[PDB]
Amino acid sequence: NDQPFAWQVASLSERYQEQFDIGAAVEPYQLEGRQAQILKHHYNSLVAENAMKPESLQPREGEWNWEGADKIVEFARKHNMELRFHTLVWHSQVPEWFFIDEDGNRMVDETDPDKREANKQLLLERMENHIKTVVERYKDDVTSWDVVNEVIDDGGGLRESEWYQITGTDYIKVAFETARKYGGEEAKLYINDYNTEVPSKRDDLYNLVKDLLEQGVPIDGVGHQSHIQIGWPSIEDTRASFEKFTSLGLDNQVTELDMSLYGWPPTGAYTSYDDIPAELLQAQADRYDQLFELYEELAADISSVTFWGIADNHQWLDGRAREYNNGVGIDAPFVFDHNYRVKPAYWRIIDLE
Ligand SMILES: [Ca+2]
């Protein structure tokens, strides 16, 4: 017999009901058919893969695009699901209008110090109003806010995005302050990043959050994107990362979990699914077994575990595979395959501890 479909097997969220919520990143067109069936049965938390990015919501000043985001919000509400917000501030694909001064010129080019100070206040003003408008619309349904995303540099220190070039660290402080102001004391505010398991980047995130917390900035938790691989990162470095942020009184959430079949870069990717050798899917299952064993071990310190997709037929790792294999290649990062059939990894995370 073939592996059963995802809608034919025991629920993931139910299995982790006493541990932490189980979430999925979705697009609005996934809220129908088999994917909607899978979400209802297996997940109790949602995040928008793309519909609530800054570029999606306010592509130009005062021009709001709520409809895709509102769908996702309604779906969460009417199925009693938690809802993460991705994301309030992010260097990736930020609408260019944010960093254009009053005359139409680029703030990053400005050389006069007094004018650079004016541009900083203008940008912080635009950021505050973006946050205030979105938080005021969605605070009733959002249960975790990714306030800023990917502000640490892989090379060490802070990422020198336009946000940092123009405002220093002030965009981060003002972002959390504004989300707290309009979200209320009950809003849960997160800083999200990837490779939080790499000790040097972990330590830079820790020292940023520690300094900001000492200055009264309201940060409730750390989001660990957890874009991981079969062989990397180690269970030990993941454990050490969660422990370090818990020691500051912060919550931990796994926010964008997916496990590539390949290393970094994903060279040698398979071209079709049926070419993936069984041994490799089983290596993925063994890795997921260990990872979710660690999550349950640390469950008191993790509120939510979200996968960056539902099933292997829609995910961003395919594009990365093609990038490094001359425009051909697929990946298979989830516990439900491209046909929605359970994978070995599903069986290794549904079973009892
Ligand atoms: Ca297991």
Author numbering: 1 to 353
Give sentences from the paper:
Xylanase [EC 3.2.1.8] hydrolyzes the internal β-1,4-linkage of xylan. A GH10 xylanase XynR was identified in the culture broth of TAR-110. GH10 and GH11 xylanases have two conserved catalytically important E residues in the active site.
The space group of the crystal was C2. The structure was refined at 1.90 Å resolution. The whole structure of T315Q exhibited no difference compared to WT13 with rmsd of 0.65 Å for 353 Cα atoms. WT had three Ca2+ ions, but T315Q had one Ca2+ ion. In T315Q, the side chain of Q315 protrudes inside, resulting in that the distance of Nε2 from the position where the Ca2+ ion located in WT was 1.8 Å. In conclusion, the alkaliphilic XynR variant T315Q lacked the Ca2+ ion near position 315 by keeping the interaction with three of four ligating residues with the Ca2+ ion. Our results suggested that T315Q, and presumably T315H, T315N, and T315S, obtained higher alkaliphily by decreasing stability accompanied by the loss of this Ca2+ ion and the resulting loop (residues 311–331) deviation.
